[PDB]
Symmetry: C3
Subunit: 105 residues, 3 copies
């Protein structure tokens, strides 16, 4: 396995998604943050089935910066309990991983 | 590795995607279902290259509910052979994982 | 773990993403390619924070064709150093996995 990771997270709108991405990148806690706006999420919250528009984010980072990234997002997110799921990366293109690794703190 | 999983699946349109998600959620087989509408999928089917609009779904659940979820979607999907790929989750925010686990059957 | 994989990659626009997908599929190096257009990616490039539109791609393939797929994309991509991250697949629907494998043999 490579040391790269892809962290999934959602935001209520593009404005908040962009602000969070900019903060994370300025702190060098991710190499690239990709936003997928216009998503819809369904889930139960306090006993009711909700259906809300959200932005699905993908934070591309590495294991050496994993906890710092999670902690940062958790403390700079509009939601109290944001989605934060780390996907492992089994392999990647050498040159891309090189760039990803070099971009981080 | 945490016990969380993210299941990839596609649906032909938002209406079918929403119905499936609502059903899975009511059955408590996923904690959150995110729909990414307006995607385009290319693939060969019966020897012909097809290019079709689809909704990419992400079902956020755990390994304990993995088989029931897969079986449920398979039996309640518009396609005869739907995409069902389980991505493992290496780690996550504990508060989020706690809510995810608590929302399941 | 199954032998399936999901490879993340981004393209600058739909035209280029579609051409790449078609080429990869003709070469039988992926069973299905899903395009998520209208995404926004933020990243530092040459010291400056960029915010650009991209298409997020998901190549659904197997470990048996993983290196050939990565090499092929790298040689047929508009970017000099494109994003190429391989996500492992823990499990999936038997019929879907069978179709994916058969499509590439
Ligand atoms: Na803006
Ligand atoms: Na902004
Ligand atoms: Na869209
Ligand atoms: Na609906
Ligand atoms: Na095209
Ligand atoms: Na052959």
């Amino acid at each position: 396995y490579s040391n790269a990771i892809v962290v999934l997270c959602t935001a209520p709108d593009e404005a908040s998604a962009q602000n969070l991405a900019a903060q994370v990148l300025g702190e060098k806690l991710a190499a690239c943050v990709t936003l997928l706006p216009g998503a819809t999420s369904l889930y139960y919250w306090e006993g009711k089935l909700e259906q809300e528009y959200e932005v699905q984010l993908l934070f591309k980072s590495n294991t050496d910066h994993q906890q710092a990234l999670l902690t940062y997002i958790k403390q700079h997110h509009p939601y109290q309990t944001p989605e934060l799921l780390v996907l492992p990366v089994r392999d990647g293109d050498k040159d891309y991983l090189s760039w990803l690794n070099a971009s981080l703190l």
